[PDB]
């Protein structure tokens, strides 16, 4: 987002947490 | 807040640094 | 828990994530 | 799964390693 | 790739940063 | 403490590991 | 910024990612 | 173990915390 | 300092937080 | 290797994952 | 470097470790 | 060391960095 954040992916139902720029 | 943020908690003695969602 | 884990604290309403042994 | 776990995702090409809640 | 790198995903999209072994 | 250390909390309880500046 | 963000540095150069409070 | 856990090593010694898959 | 410590760097504008060995 | 890389160590029993400089 | 790496800054004498893209 | 630190293992010649309690 620059910064990086650990964010829950809204894009599916497996509890995925990813990095976001 | 989702994403996780590294923030200072509100508690004076031994100021903590907690992950806030 | 040994291992360390980042876990949501069930102990209050500020979205706190902490380490757990 | 809460806690966050560093796990391999299920997707053969460029095997990912995702945080699972 | 063994080592686990923290790299952004393929597609030139998403803006997601994942573990890449 | 400046630096942010990752230490377990006071009380000899909780088992929680937090950021300690 | 309090929270500590992981962001890249000013100058549009370096390519360095630091803690930004 | 797949997931990579951060746990202390066997031997009840060292005091070392490593990645354990 | 070896170990890595998360510390504030000495530089007033946009106070950095750097790893110090 | 400097930078730090998250890699599998060479040691079959309880395959470790160590930081390599 | 894309990926992020923790690398020793060659650019000065304070043991600085930073992120690199 | 309580706290956790990423420290260079003095115990061998492969550039190993581990966690220390």
Q: Is J in contact with E (3 or more beta carbon pairs below 8 Å)? A: yes
On chain A, the residues whose CB falls within 8 A of the CB of G7 are: 2-4
Breaks (C-N over 2.5 A) in chain F follow: 1
Using left for φ > 0, alpha for ψ between -120 and 50, and beta otherwise, residue A14 falls in alpha
Q: In angstroms, what separates the C-alpha of K8 from chain J's closest C-alpha?
A: 5
Q: Which of K3, F18, E1 minimizes the C-alpha distance to C7?
A: F18
Q: Which residue of I has its CA nearest to K16?
A: I20
Return the partners of chain E (3 or more C-beta pairs < 8 Å).
Answer: A, D, J, K
Question: What DSSP designation does G15 have?
Answer: T
Q: How was this structure determined?
A: X-ray
Pairwise CB contact (< 8 Å): A6 & B3: yes
Q: In angstroms, what separates the C-alpha of A15 from chain E's closest C-alpha?
A: 14
Cα distances from I6 to residues I16, K10, L16, in angstroms, run 10, 18, 19
Pairwise CB contact (< 8 Å): K18 & I21: no
- What is the rounded distance in angstroms from the CA atom of residue B19 to the CA atom of residue K17? 22
SS3 G21: coil
- What is the rounded distance in angstroms from the CA atom of residue C7 to the CA atom of residue J19? 23
Residue D6's H or E segment, with its range, is strand D3-8
Ranges of H-type helices in A1-21: none
CA L1-L2-L4 angle, to 5 degrees, is: 55
Q: Which residue of I has its CA nearest to G16?
A: I18
On chain G, the residues whose CB falls within 8 A of the CB of I6 are: 19
Q: Which residues pair with C21 in a beta bridge?
A: none
Buried b (16+ CB within 10 A) or exposed e, H1-21: eeebbbbbbeeeeeebbbbbb
């Amino acid at each position: 987002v620059a910064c990086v954040f650990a964010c829950e992916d809204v894009g599916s139902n497996k509890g995925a947490i990813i990095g976001l720029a």
